[PDB]
Design a protein around this ligand. Structure first.
Ligand SMILES: *CC(=O)N1CCC[C@H]1c1cccc(OC)c1
Length: 185
């Protein structure tokens, strides 16, 4: 099936806990995969304009590890619940992708999660101004604008354009390559 095939592909890139104990300032993100209309999509947030760090930017759900978290995956799931109302029974964490090193002292660990078909986002306006889907296939043929490369995605439902860039854009392309490369039509 589409979903079994995606999970099987993703598992080949799982680093698991290999980098998880290193003494960094630790953050996790969830890359949430949603199946709609026979195709996979990624779920993105737009950060609230009132936040200190990166107001109004397109990001994945996530945030800083706290003492309650059993592991890095728990961080991602806790933050996703707080930001968009995703409950743990509504997500299957499939794998942990290559971490992202920044600022010399920070390690961001991305987890890919398959999202239940009955989940409906409830954006928390203290954290997130918007939540939206992009088809995974978009990231194979994006609309690129240079400012460094920025992706512009226009939602055909409403005509709204979102700008996706940096780590977030790079991770989206990675997931699209992993799942969609070399597939019969
Ligand atoms: C958009 C984005 O992913 N950002 C904004 C702040 C830095 C980065 C980030 C890094 C780790 C966790 C985040 O939580 C979503 C965000």
């Amino acid at each position: 099936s589409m979903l079994d095939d995606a999970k099987a592909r993703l598992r080949k890139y799982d680093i698991g806990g290999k980098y998880s104990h290193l003494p960094y300032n630790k953050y996790s993100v969830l890359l949430p995969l949603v199946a709609k209309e026979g195709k996979l999509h990624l779920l993105f947030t737009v950060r609230s304009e009132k936040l200190r760090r990166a107001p109004g930017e397109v990001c994945f759900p996530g945030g800083k590890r706290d003492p309650t978290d059993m592991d890095d995956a728990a961080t991602a799931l806790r933050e996703a619940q707080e930001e968009v109302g995703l409950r743990p029974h509504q997500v299957e964490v499939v794998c942990c992708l290559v971490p992202c090193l920044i600022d010399t002292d920070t390690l961001i660990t991305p987890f890919v999660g398959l999202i239940d078909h009955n989940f409906q986002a409830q954006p928390n306006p203290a954290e997130v101004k918007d939540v939206f889907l992009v088809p995974l296939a978009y990231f194979l043929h994006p609309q690129v604008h240079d400012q460094n490369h920025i992706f512009e995605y226009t939602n055909p439902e409403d005509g709204v354009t979102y700008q996706i860039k940096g780590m977030t854009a790079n991770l989206a392309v990675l997931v699209a390559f992993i799942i969609l490369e070399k597939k019969p039509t």
